[PDB]
DNA sequence: GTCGG
DNA sequence: GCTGATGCGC
DNA sequence: CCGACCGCGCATCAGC
Ligand SMILES: C[C@H](P(=O)(O)O)P(=O)(O)OP(=O)(O)OC[C@H]1O[C@@H](n2cnc3c(=O)[nH]c(N)nc32)C[C@@H]1O
Ligand SMILES: [Cl-]
Ligand SMILES: [Cl-]
Ligand SMILES: [Cl-]
Ligand SMILES: [Cl-]
Ligand SMILES: [Mg+2]
Ligand code: NA
Ligand code: NA
Ligand code: NA
């Protein structure tokens with residue numbers, strides 16, 4: 001919040017480029033600048049001062065000068081007045097509706113919450129659950145609630161098979177005082193990069209969580225990734241809790257560290273780390289860290305026994321989860 | 327939109 | 332049915 | 342300049 005105005009402006013620009021212009025690289029360019037500036041420990045006094053930071057070039061520096069000078073950006077003011085851009089930006093806020101679907105709906109004259117509701121027929125499953133919980137998915141989750149959710153998930157998982165290990169990642173593992181959703185990394189000894197000795201390992205867990213009425217809806221579901229909705233149970237006479245988004249990722253047990261590194265994030269941290277990896281001649285995914293041959297082709301997985309080993313490989317000092325919120 | 331070679 | 336591309340979201 | 346921009350699971354489609 002030290003340079004809140006500037007980062008907000010940058011985030012709005014990033015969203016515009018992503019949702020309206022469908023220019024993902026500009027989207028990421030703006031996000032990185034925002035990230036770098038949110039981390040800067042000084043109140044920015046000029047675009048020149050900001051341009052010193054990596055990721056902030058001439059264009060953004062110019063915008064920062066205008067913002068500091070007037071408290072706003074003409075480019076944005078105009079975008080806000082544009083109906084198409086506004087409608088497209090809004091629709092993309094529905095889980096399941098991306099830039100393409102948003103622009104398509106706007107072409108059909110579907111541009112509002114009211115319109116989406118009376119046109120459910122034109123939505124796929126995911127988009128339909130997204131509209132249903134539009135309001136709720138906008139709400140933040142207090143860490144105190146995340147703690148109750150963690151308690152239920154781990155205990156329910158324990159009831160299915162004592163050997164399951166459920167770990168809450170995302171911003172929660174990064175120590176956030178509030179989270180946008182719940183991310184759960186799951187492992188079982190029967191599922192390794194070597195073999196799958198038991199089927200339905202994820203399904204059994206999802207089923208058990210639906211049985212106790214914790215998971216209420218399913219956005220998408222596969223053998224290793226579940227994306228859906230959950231809700232804490234409420235007491236007698238009390239308003240029930242908002243529905244929350246929940247992601248569950250089943251990863252080979254022997255690949256836990258690369259998995260927990262990935263799922264802990266942040267997303268920008270992961271992008272920065274994976275890019276650095278490349279520069280160092282390594283490629284990193286949620287399963288392994290592999291070296292890049294002279295040709296540039298991924299080699300065999302390198303041994304990993306902790307998150308720090310991954311950091312060591314790329315010559316980065318270890319950063320605790322709480323310091324990976326970029 | 328920003329960067330490094 | 333399949334495979335491969337595209338959208339979406341993590 | 343100008344090529345690079347992280348890497349992937351699931352849903353849905355086109356084309357066979
Ligand atoms: C602050 C967010 P919340 O609290 O509001 O939920 P969060 O939990 O941090 O992010 P979530 O969107 O929940 O995704 C979970 C993780 O997935 C990883 N992740 C997400 N997007 C990406 C991506 O584009 N790339 C990679 N490599 N990892 C990603 C890193 C993320 O941490
Ligand atoms: Cl782009
Ligand atoms: Cl503005
Ligand atoms: Cl690992
Ligand atoms: Cl791999
Ligand atoms: Mg999260
Ligand atoms: Na810079
Ligand atoms: Na969306
Ligand atoms: Na979110």
Ligand code: NA
Nearest residue numbers: 181182183247
């Ligand atoms: Na998530």
